[PDB]
Design a protein that fits this description.
Blueprint: H1 13-21, H2 41-51, H3 73-81, H4 100-111, H5 126-129, H6 135-143, H7 162-176
Helix pairs in contact: 1-7, 2-3, 2-4, 4-6
PDB class: structural protein
Keywords: polysaccharide binding, polysaccharide
Assembly: monomeric
Amino acid sequence: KTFPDVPADHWGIDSINYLVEKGAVKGNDKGMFEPGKELTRAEAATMMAQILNLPIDKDAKPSFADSQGQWYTPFIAAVEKAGVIKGTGNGFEPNGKIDRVSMASLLVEAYKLDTKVNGTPATKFKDLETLNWGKEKANILVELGISVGTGDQWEPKKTVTKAEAAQFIAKTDKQFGT
């Protein structure tokens, strides 16, 4: 599968090709990959369900009142069942944009990445030093070289694009998928 908006020598091409092969990403009706498109939490959850080859049962429902009655519902059901996501009494917000720290959480839970590091990873970014949720998860991605360091900020609240998500997921799955 080739995409006009992801040329052969463009970053993300190998990651994207891997996910296409695994049935975990696609382009749109126009043939476009839309690499810069900001992903929703449901879209990220779906990519995860597909790459992990979780059983998708069309009638399965996740716990969350906010994630029913839509295309994403059985995918959210699958990822919840697998423990890739949990609930924190506050729904899943499927149509909210996913941020880097939430993506880190999906990856760490899906691949049990805490079991792939020795001890507790150091904090290498000032914006992780006092982060109130997800610090340990971000620190694991850093320790494993899955993220993406660009200075003194990890940018935990920054939204994740489709191509960025493809990179995180392809790299992690190729390394730790079972």
